[PDB]
Amino acid sequence: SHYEEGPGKNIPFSVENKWRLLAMMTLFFGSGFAAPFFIVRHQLLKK
Amino acid sequence: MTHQTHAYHMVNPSPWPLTGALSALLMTSGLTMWFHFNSMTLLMIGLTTNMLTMYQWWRDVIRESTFQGHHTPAVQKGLRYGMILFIISEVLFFTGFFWAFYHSSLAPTPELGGCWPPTGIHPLNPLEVPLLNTSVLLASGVSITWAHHSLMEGDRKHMLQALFITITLGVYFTLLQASEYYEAPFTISDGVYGSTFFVATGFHGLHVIIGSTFLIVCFFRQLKFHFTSNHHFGFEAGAWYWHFVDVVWLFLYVSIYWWGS
Amino acid sequence: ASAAKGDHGGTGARTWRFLTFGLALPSVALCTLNSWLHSGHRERPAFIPYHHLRIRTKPFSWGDGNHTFFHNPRVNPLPTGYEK
Amino acid sequence: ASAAKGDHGGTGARTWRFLTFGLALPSVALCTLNSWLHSGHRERPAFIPYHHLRIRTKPFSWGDGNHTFFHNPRVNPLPTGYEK
Amino acid sequence: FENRVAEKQKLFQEDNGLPVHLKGGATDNILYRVTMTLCLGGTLYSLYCLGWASFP
Amino acid sequence: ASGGGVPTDEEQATGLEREVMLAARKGQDPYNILAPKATSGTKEDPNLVPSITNKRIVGCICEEDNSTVIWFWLHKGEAQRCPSCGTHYKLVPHQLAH
Amino acid sequence: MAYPMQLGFQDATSPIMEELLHFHDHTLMIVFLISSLVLYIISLMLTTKLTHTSTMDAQEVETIWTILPAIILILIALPSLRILYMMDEINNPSLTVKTMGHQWYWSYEYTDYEDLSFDSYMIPTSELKPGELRLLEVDNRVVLPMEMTIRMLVSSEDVLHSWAVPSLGLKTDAIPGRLNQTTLMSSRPGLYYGQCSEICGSNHSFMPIVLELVPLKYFEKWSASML
Amino acid sequence: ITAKPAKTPTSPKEQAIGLSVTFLSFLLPAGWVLYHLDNYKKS
Amino acid sequence: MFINRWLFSTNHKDIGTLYLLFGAWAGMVGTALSLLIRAELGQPGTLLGDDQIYNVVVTAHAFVMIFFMVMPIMIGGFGNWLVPLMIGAPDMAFPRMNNMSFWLLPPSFLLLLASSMVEAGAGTGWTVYPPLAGNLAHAGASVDLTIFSLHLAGVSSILGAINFITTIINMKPPAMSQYQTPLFVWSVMITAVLLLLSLPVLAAGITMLLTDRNLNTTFFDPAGGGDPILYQHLFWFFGHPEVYILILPGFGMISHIVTYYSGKKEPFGYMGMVWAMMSIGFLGFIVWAHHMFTVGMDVDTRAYFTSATMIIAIPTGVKVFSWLATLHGGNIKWSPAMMWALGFIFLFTVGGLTGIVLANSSLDIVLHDTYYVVAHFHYVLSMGAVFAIMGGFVHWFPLFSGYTLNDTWAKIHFAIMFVGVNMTFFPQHFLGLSGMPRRYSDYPDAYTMWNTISSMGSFISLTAVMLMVFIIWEAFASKREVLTVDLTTTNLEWLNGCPPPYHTFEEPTYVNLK
Amino acid sequence: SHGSHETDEEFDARWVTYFNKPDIDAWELRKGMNTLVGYDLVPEPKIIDAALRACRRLNDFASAVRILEVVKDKAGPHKEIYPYVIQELRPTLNELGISTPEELGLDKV
Amino acid sequence: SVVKSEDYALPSYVDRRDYPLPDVAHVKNLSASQKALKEKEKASWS
Ligand code: HEA
Ligand code: HEA
Ligand SMILES: [Cu+2]
Ligand SMILES: [Cu+2]
Ligand SMILES: [Cu+2]
Ligand SMILES: [Mg+2]
Ligand code: NA
Ligand SMILES: [Zn+2]
């Protein structure tokens, strides 16, 4: 079994660079929060 | 650690839960196109990936059990609980349907004519074919029982024989019921009477088909010497599900076919 | 009715094979003769356009969307009236 | 109603002792409070000499042979009329 | 009938480092690759649909 | 005598199933299916915790009632003691694994 | 109706809506006791340096915190049950109006004798005459005889609705195919407003209920003039 | 809970950047969408 | 590799993580929907449009928070992660099936999203009752997509419930009785049983509604002789247990968090704590109808349902009092999680108390379908379920990750979130006594202040969640690996270090038979 | 075990005896104190004395000091207790030559 | 002394009022002078 172990190896995303993570994390929760807004926009832009 | 000292099973990664999850999407959104943007392509793809997934998932399950020797005592005791539990959840599913029925028949709206069965509905005769189907399923219950006893007594020929008789009575019920569906003078669209009769008997009908193919699978695993006199859970589970399937029919029979008509 | 067929309706494959061909199947045979010794045919019910029947709030996604899945022309009338 | 009290309602004396004082008895307690939180008294039913009641085809072999075993004077009238 | 289960056992017990769903042979792989493909494509198709059906 | 042809485990059980099956008849339990019965746990009569390695987690139900189990690693070497009740535990090498 | 910065219930216009105000005081008195009892015990537990982490005995105390709450529930259940039956009590109405929820308006039907029946829509914020309540105003008030036991039969002709008028302590879901009963009975003349208490579509918020209660006499003339 | 010191400590400057980026990513998209609501209702 | 580990898994740990991940994301979504709701009500008038686009938002809020955030996080996350570790199991009973329980969530979530994309979406309330939910009032692919999302999400959970019950019952050390397993495990085993019984009934209820709007059946259409009420029963039969299915696990984690920071070995009254849960589990099945008080039911049956609903106050009572007793002689550590625990204890109380008021049908006649009930459930969900989730998260984060959170940052977050919620929901108690109805995109001018204060509150909460994201980032940014953990003798999940190795208990624990 | 509860005197005795075991080793010395601290009481000077001595037997000065720290900690907000204890302990303190935490200046931060 | 992650199975040190005497010594490794101090300790504490 080639499964790495320990802090930062038991997660599906890289935790090596604090800044690349800041980006990944930001897109992740970011997109989550924005989606509802764009859905509402979508509905509003229809007829 | 490394060499495990517990009698439990650590299953190797399988891509089946993902394809199976994906299959649920395909079929559900597939049913949506059909119901609405009138089309069955997606649903066809869904039903396919689904059959493919189930075939391979149980295939592995047999591989791991019959060939690889992974089903220790501790392992099977847990498959019992799982099946037992799974059947209970089915028993609660049919409960919604019986509930709906008793709700509708116990207090008929004036729209029905303030009576049950509603005016215009012509119920089938419980004494005709509904009795035949009752006797058929019951007989399979005794023959499946003869099958399980032959198995635990190492009698290959007879297990295979009682299992065959069982499987055929089960198919005989499917056909018999299919024709009643055709000959029957009411439909899913005839208000509550039809609604209530066709989905309960219908979901049950889908269960006899699901239960029969299960038995058919057991039939083949047996020709292939898969089961030993003492290790044959696939058959124990098959028999449990089959008995569940009679009992639901015994309840539909007394409620919907007799009392409710 | 009741039931009291003397002895053996328990444990032993021979006993179960016995009930299978000695009780189970003869039953299905009786019931089968019975269900066919009355297998005539009902006269298609007189048509009356009741509103709580032949319900259609949305067209069936198959055929002309007005014919039920196991539509049987003889005994099942459309909302308008019998098939023919 | 239904029922689903999570886990343990099977094998092990400790588990059975548990249901005894954890479920069984509290029920009898509720039902006992209940049956007494309504333990008033019915007004003795108005007497009407119906023929299918107060039947007497033969005198009871006790007392004046006209009084039922658990005769309760207040709520049970004789065939002629209430006790008093 | 047969009874060549023992043969099947030896085969699946063979330490070839493969995972059980591939341990069986070449067809296991074609089946695998087929199933995986229809699922993905199907997913894409439905994505296309649920979107085409998202506008008036 | 006289049967019909279905395989016995004694002749068809394979893998771990067979392994635990045989060990069973020999009375050993290399796969921890059963509960280790205790010893007096004195310094001289400790509980012998087998192990396929140099350390093993021991759970101690100090008193029969106890809803709480006391856990701790038992390492290879001098007999150790449950933090809540003394009780001796001495590691031992595991057996019929493989 | 409700005023700005309201805390509790709107003033009771009928005897049961009064009756409930008191049952709620009773109940709310108790939730204050318990919720303050808990905040005290908590702050108490957290406010000492003294420790005792060894085992502690249960149940001997658990009898207390089990028998007590049972008593308190009896102290709420009784009054509550009393009012409940009293609401669903044997009364003899001298009038029967019906009302029917529709997707975004209520139609009322008085039909004991003549067949008086009209609609009732909210007055668009635009069409409001100075002083009129912004979203509560309806074009046709349901006029009723003050101080009289009225029987209302609520229903709908489409989706579910719920006819509610707080000041009187009434709410009865409007269900198609069903005739729910409710006894209305004011003891004060005036205008008692209400709103559709059941999600039902785009204008779920715009289908109010307004009760204009005048004395019998004015009711009779109103009716005739109403056809 | 005890822990080794940070293998890659985050200085206050960094922390401010990170706290900033986080808040923006939550506030901009929604802000834009909400900022143009009228424009949408007007079509 | 990545594919095999993250898509083809059979590891309770890896699966539990994937859940929490899905749970965090979904949480973000529900948070926004919750914020639109208040943005629409923070000022008299209409911001978005008609009750349709508004109520589409409301429904999407309810579904995302219940089925996509709370359930996955508490049961799939903390459930998958800790259960096998607390009882010393090598993994779950059905590893492969377990993986499917996860992979059914995203599809289910897509369907739910797509429902609001197509047509006008499902402005139906989370109770999705008919006629409103029917093919006339809600003609189109929306409601149907909502129903398919629910079916999948249900399949997932019952499949999960089968694994938990089998595991918890069949994979404990041979000498350990169920009366020796940790309260969290009992909490997840009881919850598993509740789902196993209630979910099937919902699936039968919504399958009926589906045939009613697609195959011409009239289960809930009077036209055919149907009953719109029959649906309410079926749904609520599952609906009440669901609220208890949402709190029991929280009840568990709280028992664990409170005991641990009091420095106690075990919690006060363990078996009473076990009985308490079992009872709540049971009574929660025979009280559904308190959700149908203003429907037209017989007064006698309306009596039964208020009485039965009140008895639940008793077992819940022994729980609240047992946790206070646990804190008792404690050597208290004012940790972030202990703050979440204490918060839960009081806030959940006020909220479950406010729910005793509602048990009275007489009084429920005028409180029903108003903002008073919005207050009630926001207290037990927003500051009960969610407060447990946070304590448990900051408590077990080191175990999952191997890294520690910044305790001060962790406390600020609490401080903020506390004010936010109490502000947001406290005034709603008045809005409801004073008559403001539920599911309204606008209100009579009188209701202006409280809705204005409440929405302001909703903004503070937003800040607290943005802050929580940063807090997680910093944690992974700095990398303060753990060194020591207290009380492991009585806390097995901490015995293999943080994080525990892919394969724990490869060699069983040793437990004597006394 | 179950219901087996001793009178105050029987408790103190059982402890003084526990600590006087000549062959008492570190494990037991720690177990004893770490156990005694869980109870609702500052230990009797007689019990604290025996543990101070057993520290000497195990040639543990440090432990002897931390033990005196605990006693004070246990008094919580009850200032009167500690000094009374240190008082009844003076003799033994002097004899074994055990410095109080306060004397060692360990009472400050 | 220096604590290591892999030390998760070995007894550890911990300062906390309700466990006054921990399972392990704060300092495991001694300097000559310490080993010396340790010797003086077997003598009279006076
Ligand atoms: C988190 C889940 C949750 C929890 C835990 C609760 C707990 C309870 N809730 Fe529920 N409630 C909801 C969430 C849940 N609820 C939801 C989501 C809805 C609305 C959904 C919708 O319709 O859209 C709702 C709606 C709802 C209704 C319907 C109101 C209406 O719409 O007309 C009712 C009424 O009976 C009710 C009551 C209760 C009760 C009696 C409890 C009891 O569990 C509370 C018990 C707790 C205590 C009482 C405190 C602890 C005990 C003590 C301190 C001892 C002293 C106690 C006494 C002596 C009183 N709630
Ligand atoms: C779990 C359930 C839940 C939760 C937590 C909330 C949280 C929120 N709810 Fe909602 N709400 C309901 C479920 C929930 N709600 C339901 C069932 C309805 C009824 C729908 C109907 O009528 O049909 C509803 C109704 C409802 C209404 C009334 C709508 C109406 O009837 O007109 C309002 C308005 O004020 C609202 C407000 C809020 C707000 C501002 C939040 C805010 O408090 C949210 C703040 C954010 C959080 C507190 C969550 C943050 C936590 C996380 C995201 C976890 C992060 C993860 C990790 C730590 C790893 N909710
Ligand atoms: Cu309405
Ligand atoms: Cu409405
Ligand atoms: Cu409820
Ligand atoms: Mg309602
Ligand atoms: Na508004
Ligand atoms: Zn012990």
Coordinates of C-alpha atoms in Angstrom, one line a residue, chain H residues 8-37:
Chain H
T8 CA 6.2 27.2 9.0
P9 CA 4.9 30.0 11.3
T10 CA 2.6 32.6 9.9
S11 CA 3.8 36.1 10.7
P12 CA 1.1 38.8 11.4
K13 CA 1.7 40.3 7.9
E14 CA 0.9 36.9 6.3
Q15 CA -2.1 36.5 8.6
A16 CA -3.5 39.9 7.5
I17 CA -3.1 38.9 3.8
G18 CA -4.8 35.6 4.4
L19 CA -7.6 37.1 6.5
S20 CA -8.0 39.7 3.7
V21 CA -8.1 37.3 0.8
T22 CA -10.6 35.1 2.6
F23 CA -13.1 38.0 3.3
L24 CA -12.8 39.3 -0.3
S25 CA -13.5 35.9 -1.8
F26 CA -16.7 35.8 0.2
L27 CA -17.7 39.5 -0.3
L28 CA -16.9 40.4 -3.9
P29 CA -18.9 37.8 -5.9
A30 CA -22.0 38.3 -3.8
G31 CA -21.4 42.0 -3.8
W32 CA -21.3 42.1 -7.6
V33 CA -24.5 40.0 -7.9
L34 CA -26.3 42.1 -5.3
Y35 CA -25.0 45.4 -6.7
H36 CA -26.8 44.7 -10.1
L37 CA -30.1 43.4 -8.8

